[PDB]
C-alpha cells in the first residue's frame, strides 16, 4: 500500500528538521543574501528564472568553498528557501551535487511551496537516478500547481486534513497536483501546526485513490523485474561469450586473427558460424551491456561503488574482447577516427570505471608467463592500425602531393610506430597480431616498402624475426 509513504512522512514530521528550518526562515524574513544559520551540526541556510541563478552565481562562487567544507565535515547540510528562494536553492544544490562526489554525505534540498519550471528533458535525464533523492517539495492538498513546460522533479509531500504523505512517482505526482495554481498561499506555520496536531491525533484517514497505488506498485514490480532479469541474464551473457572465445580459438588455430576473419566475413559472407556469431551473440551482448550502462548510471547499485566487481570485471573483458569487432564494422564503411569521432559511450564509461577502480589494486606481472591467452589492453589499438593504413595509401596512390601533407603523414606514421613499439615493449598486446595473414603483417610490409633506408627499434625487431619468440616464453 502507498500508506508506507505517509509512514515515513510521520518520521519526517517527528524530527524538528522542517520545524527548525521554517522557524529560521521566518526569523530571517521577519537580494541574494544567503544567511547561514548553522548552529552546531546542521547547515540551515535560507536562499534569498535562470537570470536569478546567473546573478547569484557571483556569491555562489565564494559560498561553494564553505559548502564543500561543510560537506567534508560530515555535518548535515540543508538548503531551502521561499517560492523563488526555494527554486534558487534547488538549483544551487543540484549544481553542487553535479560537482560534488557521491561518496560524501549527499545534501537534501527542501522547497517551501516554491514553484520551479522543470524542463521535461531534465526530468527524463534524472528520472530514476538518485538525484531526486536530494530534492523534496511542500505542496498542500488545497493548493495545486498546473504547469505545461515545467515538470515535477524529485519527491513531493502532499498534506491533507490531518497529516501528510510523501511520494515520488512523477506521473502520480503530476496527476495529484494537476490542479491549477492557486494565488492564495496559506501560512506555512499554520500547515506545520496542523500537521503537528494530526501527528498528535489518534488516527488519520486515507485520501490517495487506488489508481495511484496501482501505478506505483506496477512501476516498482517492473523495475524489480528488470533488475533481477539483468542480474540473471549476466550468466547467459557469459555463456554466449564462451562461444566467442571458442570461435577466436578456432580462428587462431587457422593462423589468422579472428578480427581479420570477421572483417572478411562481413565483406564476403561464406559460412554460417560467422553469421550466427555476428547476428546472434554480439547483437545480444551489445544490447545487454548498453542497457546495463544506461540504467546503472542513473541509480548506482551501491553507494561509493558504481557497480559490484562481478559486473565491472566482466564488462572489462567484454569490452576488451568485443570492441575490435565494432572497430572493424566502423572502418569497413569508410569512416575514420573511431577513437574520437565515432566511439560509443558505454565502452568509454566501462573503461573509465575500470581505470578508476583498479588503481587501488596491487597487481604484479612476471617476465615468464605465456601471453598466448592475453587480451590487448588498448581495445582501440586495431583502430589506430586501420588509420595508419589509410595514410599509407595516401602516400602510394596519391601523386603530386604538397610537402606539408607529406611531412604531416610522415610524422603521423613515425608517432604510430613509436606508440606501437612502446605498447609492445610493455608486453600489453596478444601475439595474435603477429599472425601471418593478419592486417598487421600487411601494414608492416607497406611500412617497409615506404621506409627505404630509415631504421629504428621496431624495424630491427621485425627484421631480426624476434617477434616469433615474443610471447612463447
Amino acid at each position: 500500500s502507498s500508506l508506507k509513504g505517509s509512514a515515513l512522512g510521520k518520521l519526517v514530521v517527528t524530527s524538528g528538521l522542517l520545524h527548525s528550518s521554517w522557524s529560521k526562515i521566518l526569523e530571517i524574513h521577519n537580494g541574494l543574501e544567503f544567511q547561514i544559520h548553522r548552529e552546531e551540526k546542521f547547515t540551515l541556510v535560507v536562499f534569498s528564472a535562470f537570470n536569478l541563478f546567473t546573478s547569484a552565481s557571483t556569491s555562489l562562487t565564494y559560498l561553494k568553498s564553505e559548502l564543500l567544507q561543510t560537506l567534508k565535515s560530515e555535518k548535515p547540510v540543508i538548503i531551502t528557501g521561499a517560492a523563488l528562494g526555494g527554486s534558487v536553492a534547488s538549483l544551487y544544490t543540484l549544481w553542487l551535487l553535479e560537482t560534488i562526489e557521491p561518496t560524501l554525505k549527499r545534501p537534501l534540498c527542501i522547497t517551501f511551496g516554491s514553484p520551479l519550471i522543470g524542463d521535461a528533458s531534465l526530468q527524463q535525464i534524472l528520472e530514476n537516478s538518485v538525484r531526486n533523492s536530494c530534492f523534496l517539495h511542500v505542496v498542500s492538498a488545497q493548493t495545486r500547481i498546473k504547469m505545461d513546460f515545467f515538470k515535477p522533479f524529485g519527491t513531493f509531500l502532499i498534506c491533507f486534513d490531518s497529516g501528510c504523505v510523501c511520494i515520488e512517482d512523477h506521473v502520480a505526482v503530476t496527476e495529484l497536483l494537476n490542479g491549477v495554481h492557486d494565488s492564495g498561499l496559506v501560512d506555512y506555520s499554520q500547515v506545520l501546526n496542523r500537521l503537528d496536531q494530526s501527528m498528535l491525533s489518534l488516527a488519520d484517514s486515507r485520501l490517495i485513490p487506488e489508481d495511484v497505488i496501482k501505478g506505483i506498485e506496477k512501476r516498482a514490480e517492473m523495475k524489480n523485474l528488470r533488475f533481477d532479469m539483468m542480474f540473471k541474464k549476466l550468466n547467459d551473457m557469459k555463456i554466449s561469450m564462451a562461444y566467442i572465445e571458442w570461435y577466436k580459438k578456432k580462428c587462431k588455430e587457422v593462423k589468422i586473427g579472428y578480427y581479420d576473419r570477421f572483417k572478411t566475413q562481413l565483406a564476403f559472407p561464406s559460412k554460417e558460424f560467422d553469421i550466427n556469431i555476428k547476428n546472434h551473440h554480439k547483437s545480444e551482448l551489445n544490447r545487454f551491456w548498453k542497457s546495463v550502462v544506461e540504467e546503472v548510471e542513473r541509480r548506482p547499485q551501491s553507494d561509493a561503488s558504481i557497480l559490484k566487481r562481478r559486473f565491472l570485471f566482466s564488462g572489462n573483458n567484454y569490452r576488451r574482447m568485443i570492441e575490435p569487432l565494432d572497430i572493424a564494422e566502423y572502418y569497413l564503411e569508410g569512416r575514420k577516427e573511431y577513437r574520437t569521432t565515432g566511439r560509443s559511450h558505454h565502452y568509454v564509461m566501462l573503461e573509465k570505471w575500470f581505470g578508476m577502480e583498479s588503481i587501488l589494486i596491487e597487481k604484479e606481472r612476471c617476465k615468464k608467463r605465456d601471453l598466448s591467452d592475453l587480451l590487448t589492453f588498448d581495445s582501440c589499438f586495431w583502430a589506430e592500425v586501420e588509420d595508419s593504413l589509410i595514410v599509407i595509401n595516401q602516400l602510394n596512390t596519391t601523386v603530386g602531393m604538397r610537402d606539408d601533407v607529406r611531412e604531416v603523414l610522415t610524422r603521423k606514421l613515425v608517432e604510430f610506430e613509436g606508440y606501437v613499439w612502446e605498447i609492445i615493449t610493455k608486453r600489453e598486446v596478444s601475439p595474435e597480431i603477429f599472425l601471418e595473414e593478419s592486417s598487421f603483417m600487411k601494414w608492416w610490409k607497406e611500412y617497409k616498402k615506404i621506409k627505404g633506408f630509415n631504421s629504428s627499434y621496431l624495424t630491427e625487431f621485425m627484421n631480426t624475426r624476434k617477434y616469433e619468440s615474443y610471447g612463447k616464453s
Binding site: S1, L3, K4, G5, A7, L8, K10, L11, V12, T14, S15, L17, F42, P76, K105, R106, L108, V130, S133, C134, L136, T155, C166, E168, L202, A203, I216, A220, F231, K232, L234, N235, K238, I239, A242, W246, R299, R309, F313, N316, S358, I361, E362, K363, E364, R365, C366, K368, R369, L371, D373, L374
Partner: protein
C-alpha cells in the same frame, strides 16, 4: 500449551522473583525436581545506562571466546548487547559467584532449571540462559537440558543479530516474556539516553518497588512517557518503512541525520489483557505492537496513562494469580486477528502493520519452499552427477587431473564442463543473494542437507573456478585470487561447514599457483605450512590424492623442481 509451561511453574517463578527481590544477587529455590534461580533487580538509573561508555544507548560488541554461536555465519559479524547487563552477568558469573557449583550439581542431577526475573534481573536471566546454552546444551547433546527462561516485562537486551542468532539455533522457543498492556519498562531502553537523561533518575526512583514513597511528579512522568513513546513511534515507523522497502534512497538520506536504538525483541512475547492473554512470536510484529497497544485513547486516557504505567509494573501479581481464568489466543494461529486487535485496544494502523509482517513471513517461507523445490529437481543434480562421475574418471585415466585438462581446454568436454560450472555458480550466487537480503527463514542457513549440498558443490567446482581464473591471466589484472577473486558463495559455504562440524583444502591449488616460479627460500615457511595441512586434508577427503599426485599435474612438477633438502626432510617423500 504450546509454550511448554504450566501454572505451578509460573507461580514458582513468581515466588522466586519475589524472594530474590531483595539485594541478594542469586536466589535458589529447589521445588520437586526443578531448581529455579532468581536475580536481584535494580532501580538506579546508573544500572540501566552504563556511565563508562560513550555510546548514545549503551551498546557493546560481544566477544568470540564466550558467545561463538551468537554471530552471523555469512557476514561473520558479532552482535551487540547492553553493557550494564553484560557487566552484571560477568560479575555474578565469576569464580566466587558460587553459581558455577550450583549449576554443575544441577546438571549432574538431571533436573529442570529456569532463570527468571521481574524487572531487570530477568533480562540478566536471558544473558544467563544463552550462556547456559553456549556451554552445555550446544556442546553436550548427551543432556536433555532444555532450559526455560521466564521474564515479566523485561527491557530489550538484544539487537536484530541477537534475535537472528537465537532463531537460527532453534532456541527462541525456550523464552517467554509476559508484559501488561501499560508497562513502559520494556520500551525505556528504546528511548534516547539524552532525551530522558534527566527524568530517568526520578522515573527509576518512583518505579522502585521497595521505595514507593517517592514524590511522583506528574509533569516529569508525563514528559518522560511522551519522549519514550515518541522515540518508539519513530523506530516503529522506520521499521515498517524498511519492511515495505519503498523509498530506500530517501529513507537512508533521512536516517543519515536521525538516530534510532538498535534494540529488538528477543523470543516470544505474551501481552496480558484484563481478561485475555495474547501471544506473539514474530519480532517485528512484537515491536510494532509495543507502540500501538499503549497508544493514547483519549484526553482522559492520555492523562491517566502515567498512573497505569506506574502501577502495572508492580501489579504483576494480579495476572500471575488470575492466569487460571483467562482467554488464550495465538495470533499466528488465526489469521483474522481483528478479534484480539479490537479486544486489546489497537487501531487499524497496528492491525495493517502486523498483517504486513505476517505476509512478509509467509512470503519468505514461500521463497524457501521454492528454493527447496528448485534444488530438488533432477535436472539440477544431473549436472553435478555428470561433473563428478563422467569428467573426472576420464581425465584421471588420461594420466592427468581434470584441473590441468580444464586449464588447457582442447577437448569438447571442456565446453560442457565450463557451461555446467557457470550455470551452477549462477544458481548458487542467486540463492546467496536471495538469502543475503534477509528474505529466507533463519532456520534455512541451519539446515544440514543444504550445508552438505553446498560443501559438495564447493569441493567439486572450486578447482574448476580456480583453473578458469588462472588459465586466462585474470589475476594479473585483478590480483591474487585469495584476495579479490574468490566468489562470496564459496566463503559462506566454507564458513557454514566449519561452523557445523564444531585455510581450506579447496584453495589448495590457489596456493600452488603462487609459490610456483618464485625462489624456494623466500617461501620455505609457507611451503612447510602447506606440507602439513595437505597431509591431514588427505585424511578428511578435502583433496583426493589420486589427483594431485598424478603424473601431468602441475603440483608434482613444482614439488620435483624444489631443492633436494626440502624433499629430503619432507613427509611427502613417499608419494614421489
Amino acid at each position: 500449551a504450546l509454550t511448554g509451561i504450566n501454572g505451578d511453574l509460573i507461580t514458582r517463578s513468581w515466588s522466586a522473583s519475589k524472594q530474590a527481590y531483595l539485594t541478594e544477587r542469586y536466589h535458589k529455590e529447589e521445588a520437586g525436581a526443578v531448581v529455579i534461580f532468581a536475580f536481584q533487580p535494580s532501580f538506579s538509573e546508573k544500572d540501566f545506562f552504563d556511565p563508562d561508555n560513550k555510546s548514545s544507548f549503551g551498546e557493546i560488541k560481544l566477544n568470540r571466546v564466550q558467545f561463538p554461536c551468537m554471530r552471523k555465519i555469512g557476514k561473520g559479524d558479532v552482535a551487540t548487547v547492553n553493557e550494564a547487563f553484560l557487566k552484571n552477568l560477568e560479575a555474578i558469573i565469576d569464580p566466587r559467584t558460587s553459581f558455577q557449583a550450583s549449576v554443575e550439581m544441577a546438571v549432574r542431577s538431571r533436573k529442570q532449571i529456569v532463570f527468571t526475573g521481574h524487572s531487570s534481573g530477568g533480562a540478566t536471566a536471558i544473558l544467563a540462559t544463552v550462556w547456559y546454552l553456549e556451554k552445555y546444551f550446544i556442546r553436550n547433546p548427551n543432556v536433555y537440558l532444555e532450559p526455560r527462561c521466564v521474564t515479566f516485562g523485561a527491557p530489550l537486551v538484544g539487537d536484530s543479530i541477537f534475535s537472528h542468532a537465537l532463531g537460527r539455533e532453534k532456541w527462541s522457543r525456550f523464552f517467554v516474556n509476559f508484559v501488561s498492556r501499560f508497562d513502559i519498562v520494556p520500551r525505556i531502553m528504546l528511548a534516547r539516553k539524552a532525551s530522558v537523561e534527566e527524568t530517568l533518575p526520578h522515573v527509576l526512583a518512583q518505579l522502585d518497588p521497595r521505595k514507593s514513597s517517592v514524590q511522583e511528579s506528574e509533569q516529569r512522568i508525563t514528559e518522560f512517557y511522551t519522549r519514550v513513546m515518541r522515540d518508539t513511534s519513530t523506530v516503529a515507523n522506520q521499521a515498517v518503512c524498511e519492511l515495505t522497502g519503498s523509498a530506500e534512497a530517501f529513507l537512508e538520506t533521512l536516517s543519515s541525520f536521525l538516530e534510532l536504538s538498535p534494540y529488538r525483541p528477543a523470543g516470544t512475547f505474551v501481552f496480558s489483557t484484563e481478561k485475555r492473554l495474547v501471544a506473539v512470536n514474530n519480532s517485528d510484529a512484537i515491536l510494532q505492537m509495543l507502540f500501538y497497544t499503549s497508544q493514547a485513547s483519549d484526553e482522559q486516557e492520555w492523562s491517566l496513562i502515567p498512573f497505569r504505567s506506574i502501577r502495572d509494573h508492580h501489579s504483576y501479581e494480579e495476572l500471575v494469580q488470575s492466569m487460571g481464568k483467562k482467554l488464550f489466543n495465538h495470533l499466528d494461529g488465526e489469521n483474522s486477528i481483528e478479534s484480539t486487535l479490537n479486544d486489546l485496544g489497537v487501531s487499524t494502523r497496528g492491525r495493517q502493520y502486523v498483517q504486513a509482517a505476517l505476509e512478509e513471513e509467509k512470503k519468505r517461507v514461500e521463497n524457501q519452499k521454492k528454493i527447496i523445490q528448485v534444488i530438488e529437481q533432477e535436472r539440477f543434480l544431473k549436472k553435478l552427477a555428470w561433473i563428478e562421475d563422467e569428467y573426472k574418471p576420464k581425465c584421471q585415466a588420461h594420466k592427468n587431473g581434470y584441473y590441468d585438462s580444464f586449464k588447457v581446454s582442447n577437448e569438447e568436454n571442456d565446453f560442457k564442463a565450463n557451461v555446467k560450472r557457470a550455470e551452477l555458480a549462477g544458481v548458487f550466487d542467486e540463492v546467496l543473494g536471495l538469502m543475503k537480503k534477509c528474505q529466507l527463514p533463519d532456520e534455512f542457513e541451519g539446515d544440514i542437507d543444504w550445508i552438505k549440498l553446498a560443501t559438495r558443490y564447493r569441493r567439486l567446482v572450486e578447482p574448476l573456478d580456480i583453473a578458469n581464473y588462472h588459465r586466462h591471466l585474470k589475476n594479473e589484472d585483478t590480483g591474487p585470487y585469495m584476495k579479490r577473486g574468490r566468489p562470496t558463495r564459496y566463503i559462506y559455504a566454507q564458513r557454514g561447514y566449519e561452523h557445523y562440524i564444531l585455510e581450506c583444502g579447496s584453495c589448495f591449488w590457489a596456493e600452488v599457483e603462487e609459490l610456483k616460479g618464485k625462489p624456494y627460500e623466500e617461501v620455505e615457511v609457507r611451503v612447510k605450512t602447506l606440507e602439513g595441512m595437505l597431509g591431514e586434508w588427505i585424511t578428511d577427503g578435502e583433496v583426493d590424492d589420486k589427483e594431485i599426485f598424478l603424473e601431468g599435474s602441475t603440483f608434482r612438477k613444482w614439488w620435483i623442481t624444489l631443492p633436494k633438502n626440502h624433499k629430503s626432510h619432507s613427509p611427502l617423500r613417499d608419494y614421489m
